[PDB]
Write a protein that binds this ligand. Structure first.
Ligand code: AGS
Ligand code: AGS
Ligand code: AGS
Ligand code: AGS
Ligand code: AGS
Ligand code: CL
Ligand code: CL
Ligand code: MG
Ligand code: MG
Ligand code: MG
Ligand code: MG
Ligand code: MG
Lengths: 724, 546, 196
């Protein structure tokens, strides 16, 4: 294994003519940043590119774009030889031709809009036969280098002339399309796409290798998540990137056919896949074929489910075939399919978080010229409850808007197309703001699972409590070894209790943020919403999701609402089931359960039993010092006048809760706003506003309440015996 | 490579029973037809998915050398209306042709679910077709029919009738010992690193089933291969053996696979021998003796009880303040008696749907019979008391009472109940013949408190400076659970200091003194008075309560 | 005498939304085939009975000059098993032939109700048949499918999925101002007394 041999890996630099190595390997081969390297792949093909450094890149691998990958007839994980190329000199004339299926809709000067800015100030090293991709004018066209004066390879200097005269050449049989789906078309679910890659890469990429080992590979992988999350997308991507044969089975399509045809088509699909192994059979909308057995009333329907189960069992032949399936509702699928030997591996492709949505927005703005005022991060932040498909649609909609208002001119040209103008089309931030108002988000009702953006900085006071939370949650995650030496197993869960509006919810999210661990919030009322009969499967679904997202902190907020509802046969079944789930929850799984209640007087003692929420943390009203910290936190984002004294404000609000102070800021902020409108000034919030707001300010926690809360702080653990 | 008994672990007893039923008539058929006694014909294997039901069936077929005809539920049900019935008919005819033979019906419930669970005339007809075929075994050509199902309750009860599937075998989930046995099976062919300790893996993998373990091992191998092939860069179609032998499977390869594991039978009720011994319990010495008299003696010395002419009590009731070792005692006595143990917590019973709850309670008592000698433990009863004063809590307990009465004392099934609230317990449970042995379990006295501290700190490195006898003297009124929390809170301090500054990892006196400053009592004085009162008057709650 | 936007009142905003969705792909089809961005495929009009859902569909067809193929739920579901599935096939096939075109499925819930309300094997086959056809619009043959239903909740949720009826428009009940507009439309040809 000489140093020149390296393994292909994902790319970070979107540039076509760029490949990356690690500094230690770049020094090993004796190459530097400016150097032009020659890459030799399989099938006796070659590609030339500029080399760069990458600290993240492992020395045994090389990052190259999918364009470079194709020019080499290579895939992820393959081996290629790299050797220095100082022999590259500037070109005299270059001849590139477009590929028919990517240019048949546009007319005009293809060279000025695409090739011009692509090679401008680029000095790209190219090779004869290479296919490169240029995106612009809401389209991506790929050209193939037909010839270069210094053949077979040369750099494109300003002196090099270009000729792109000619009817687009037709697609060669072996030349795979770059319009086809790949991993670079997927974002917002890195972790999941990784899991699938691990499961599938080995048996699909190295089939002979798996047959010799005798260890069992995966056969059934079930992707699930709301509609439009990219389940169908991932299946296609994995097939292309691994180079496996892809046979799609659409649930509805099969169920639209006669009894005999459905049975027949399923058979053929499997037979065809085995014929072209290695292969991936993807069953889209699986629930269409195999819903819960109780809902599958009908003879023809029952036969097809059984037909599928048998075919799945028939995969014991081990004909290098993987079966992937997608369903919106994991509970809808006949449980017979989730049994071992069939779909025995599941991957939850949930809804994207802020970071994810941003990743996605970037995917569908590749080909569009974006104005400077456009801020996708805002859009991402703003489009909560949006799913991949939602984002993909709004981008199309924001583009279509830019066309409409700019169509005034095009119409007179409709007869023909204005390619040169298509580039002049920019998409303003307004075009997104417009599309934002018109958006119909689908996954708002979905339970969100992501890392909270609430940090310790957002919480005033409670310093020692933050400390105790790091010991309970962070230490066992970051320092498992230490716990084993002392021979103690760490506690499973925590219970926040105290007066309303003191930061119980904030603490739950904060500790999750510190551990960069997933967070799931489920408020009392949410648990009382689930239909009575349905309640049983939903509580379980929650803990399942918590396991999927480990390390994860599961937070049961507003527990007092459920307490009031019991003393309710529904509220009883739920909490009793949560208790059951808690016990089944192994502490070793790194799932932390936190509960919060404003009413420790009516909380179910069962929840406080050792092994459950046995860590009783009291969270009181903020003392003088803390109140100042809270006031700063809320006023961080706001323009405050220098005259406003918060140390005094805190001194006057002894007994006020954290939420009360926030409300005071809001009321004082509302006064400043009022004055900004009536009299046209940049608003500032000054002493007079706080004084006026304070005169009407009221306290949410009475003295009587305090006395009671203080008493429970010393006697809450005693509620498991006889009541007080 | 064919399956055999040596490929099966975690169910020795069950695999033995099947051998008895099947081996004689299958190996010595001529002998049985002459004997004139009727043998078993229908054996029903049941248990969660992946427990090795299909594995066991095939193993028995190969090991006995009998002709094996497999009937897969789904495949039968994938055929046309008349066709399903016809295929069933042929299967039986083909087996009779090649007798001795074993017909294995995998996923039986796919063919014959409850009469009410069937939708369609055609489906009902297939069930009848099967029922008739089983009756046709009166031919006595002597083919034995084995069947597997995840859910015994789903099966049409008509199948459990005499002459059909009149024998059942519960292939439940494997216990710690079993899981270890299985792990050894799927690590037979792998080069195992020295740091690997399967016994830990076995202990750690609770709620894991055979198939899960087989997978956990499989995934552990792929981890060693992935990380070690990256480097080799062999790409070869055929692989060299010497490389495969040099390939070892580290304990990390298991821990990684452990975190990535989706255990399937975690929601299942476990039936195994507890690993809790008397040594884990401090004090309560006299109670431990009384438990041996009540549970062990009638098992180990049945002859003695017969001569004195008394039938031993059926069950016990632990009652007292929270966190004093009621749960520990239940598991402990089972450990001493080498008897199976089944725990059923209050909340577990209140989870069951209202209607479904009734069949589950029966199933629990059924499992208790299967595992005799067995101690059935109903824990956290106080949760159920509170829930009644609830039509659900009522139906459950009333059925538990019914089940208790149906339980014959000779079955060697001992029922124990535990509650922290003797003031709201249903008097019906305390009636002679049920849980009439009322054992009060109080806070630990000074001497007892020392024993508890000793037990909990066994696993931990404690400084020699720490005086536990003094700790015990100052913690009068603290429960067993309170003491464990002091140790844990004191250990959290020792750990905290260990992280920031790499210091000798030991917990010392100063940590305990700090833990003691914030320590609080879980049982107040008022509670004690009440518990002490009920200790003398709990038997009087069957009349008019005070 | 044919219907147009001037025959519609009481829903300015809604009729505007529909016009935007439909104008680009139906009026300037060539541009959409060349550009590569995806247009709407399924527009679902919903509201109480008699709000003018069927009216709007007809108007949009005429004003755009697109080929209009009507599919009446009840009519299709009144035919034998084979004819029902076949007629759906025919509708999509001809619409693709005469693109640009608008397929209007009136009383959608008659064909594709909630899966739970769909007692019958043959009935579900038709729903699946429809779902496939909608997916078959991947041809991107300048064809738009509009549908009307009294109860949006009654429709099989599979139809509201992306790629199918991914756009919805609420044509609610008209307000006072709206009702006035309507009254003027149907009193155009009548000589109205002064006291009116
Ligand atoms: N994670 C994603 N990253 C990038 N694009 C996405 C992602 N998810 C969805 N999209 C886009 O939205 C479209 C919908 O993706 P789909 O493959 O249809 O997901 P889906 O879950 O299979 O949809 P359903 O369940 O059939 S409605 C795709 O065509 C993508 O363009
Ligand atoms: N320590 C704090 N620091 C900053 N803001 C606080 C703090 N405590 C309370 N708040 C404010 O009160 C709001 C809600 O606080 P929570 O985290 O929900 O506390 P809580 O104990 O759950 O009380 P409730 O019943 O939810 S108001 C937040 O949005 C804050 O604006
Ligand atoms: N007791 C066991 N001993 C050894 N391996 C086991 C055992 N149980 C399960 N396995 C493994 O799990 C695999 C599948 O087990 P099965 O024989 O299919 O059990 P099963 O109960 O019939 O599964 P279902 O119910 O059809 S999903 C076997 O091939 C073994 O590799
Ligand atoms: N006598 C004891 N010896 C050792 N540990 C004890 C003792 N009593 C209680 N504990 C501790 O308390 C924990 C639980 O006690 P249990 O055995 O469950 O008694 P309990 O009456 O059921 O108390 P609760 O209500 O479950 S907290 C155990 O895990 C021990 O750590
Ligand atoms: N917004 C409107 N503007 C002008 N005329 C209307 C309007 N709405 C209803 N009408 C009249 O009332 C009749 C209503 O018929 P439709 O257009 O079929 O409404 P519809 O909601 O589709 O009826 P259903 O729901 O199928 S019973 C029309 O033919 C018009 O004459
Ligand atoms: Cl509660
Ligand atoms: Cl009770
Ligand atoms: Mg899809
Ligand atoms: Mg809160
Ligand atoms: Mg099986
Ligand atoms: Mg206990
Ligand atoms: Mg109508």
């Amino acid at each position: 294994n000489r140093p020149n041999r390296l393994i292909v890996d994902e790319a970070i630099n979107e540039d076509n003519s760029v490949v990356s190595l690690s500094q230690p390997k770049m020094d090993e081969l004796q190459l530097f940043r400016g150097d032009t390297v020659l890459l030799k792949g399989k099938k006796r093909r070659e590609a030339v590119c500029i080399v760069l450094s990458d600290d993240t890149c492992s020395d045994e691998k090389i990052r190259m774009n999918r364009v470079v990958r194709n020019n080499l007839r290579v895939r992820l994980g393959d081996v290629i030889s790299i050797q220095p190329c100082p022999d590259v000199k500037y070109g005299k004339r270059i001849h590139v031709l477009p590929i028919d299926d990517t240019v048949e809709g546009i007319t005009g000067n293809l060279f000025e809009v695409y090739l011009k800015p692509y090679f401008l100030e680029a000095y790209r090293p190219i090779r004869k036969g290479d296919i490169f991709l240029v995106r612009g004018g809401m389209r991506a066209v790929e050209f193939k280098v037909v010839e270069t004066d210094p053949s077979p390879y040369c750099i494109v200097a300003p002196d090099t002339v270009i000729h792109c005269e000619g009817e687009p050449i037709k697609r060669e049989d072996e030349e795979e399309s770059l319009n086809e789906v790949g991993y670079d078309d997927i974002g917002g679910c890195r972790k999941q796409l990784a899991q699938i890659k691990e499961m599938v890469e080995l048996p699909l990429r190295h089939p002979a290798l798996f047959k010799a080992i005798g260890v069992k590979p995966p056969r059934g992988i079930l992707l699930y998540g709301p509609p439009g999350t990219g389940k169908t997308l991932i299946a296609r991507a994995v097939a292309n990137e691994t180079g496996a044969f892809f046979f799609l089975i659409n649930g509805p399509e099969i169920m639209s056919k006669l009894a005999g045809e459905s049975e027949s088509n399923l058979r053929k699909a499997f037979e065809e896949a085995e014929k072209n192994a290695p292969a991936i059979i993807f069953i889209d909308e699986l629930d269409a074929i195999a819903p819960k057995r109780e809902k599958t009333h009908g003879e023809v329907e029952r036969r097809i489910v059984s037909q599928l189960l048998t075919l799945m069992d028939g995969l014991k032949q081990r004909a290098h075939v993987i079966v992937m399936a997608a369903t919106n509702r994991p509970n809808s699928i006949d449980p017979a399919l989730r049994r071992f030997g069939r779909f025995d591996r599941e991957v939850d492709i949930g809804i994207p978080d802020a970071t994810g949505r941003l990743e996605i927005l970037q995917i569908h703005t590749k080909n569009m010229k974006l104005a400077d005022d456009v801020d996708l991060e805002q859009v991402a932040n703003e489009t909560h409850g949006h799913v991949g498909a939602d984002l993909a649609a709004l981008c199309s909609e924001a583009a279509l808007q830019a066309i409409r208002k700019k169509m005034d001119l095009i119409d007179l040209e409709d007869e023909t197309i204005d390619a040169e103008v298509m580039n002049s089309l920019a998409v303003t931030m307004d075009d997104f703001r417009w599309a934002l108002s018109q958006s119909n988000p689908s996954a708002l009702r979905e339970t969100v699972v992501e890392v909270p953006q609430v940090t310790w900085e957002d919480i005033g006071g409670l310093e020692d409590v933050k400390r105790e939370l790091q010991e309970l949650v962070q230490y066992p995650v970051e320092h498992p070894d230490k716990f084993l030496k002392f021979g103690m197993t760490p506690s499973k869960g925590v219970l926040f209790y105290g007066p309303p509006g003191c930061g119980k919810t904030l603490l739950a999210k904060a500790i999750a943020n510190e551990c960069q661990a997933n967070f799931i919030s489920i408020k009392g009322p949410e648990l009382l919403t689930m239909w009575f009969g349905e309640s049983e499967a939903n509580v379980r679904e929650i803990f399942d999701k918590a396991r999927q997202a480990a390390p994860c902190v599961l937070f049961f907020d507003e527990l007092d609402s459920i307490a009031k509802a019991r003393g309710g046969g529904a509220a009883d079944r739920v909490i009793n089931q949560i208790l059951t789930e808690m016990d089944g929850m192994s502490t070793k799984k790194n799932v932390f359960i936190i509960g919060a209640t404003n009413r420790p007087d009516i909380i179910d003692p069962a929840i406080l039993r050792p092994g459950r929420l046995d860590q009783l943390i009291y969270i009181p009203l903020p003392d003088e010092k803390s109140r100042v910290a809270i006031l700063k936190a809320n006023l961080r984002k706001s323009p405050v006048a220098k005259d406003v004294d918060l140390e005094f404000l805190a001194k006057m609000t002894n007994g006020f809760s954290g939420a009360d102070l926030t409300e005071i800021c809001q009321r004082a902020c509302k006064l400043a706003i009022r004055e900004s409108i009536e009299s046209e000034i940049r608003p500032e919030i000054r002493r007079d506003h706080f004084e006026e707001a304070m005169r009407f300010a009221r306290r949410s926690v009475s003295d009587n309440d305090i006395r009671k809360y203080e008493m429970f702080a010393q006697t809450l653990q005693q509620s498991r015996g006889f009541g007080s």
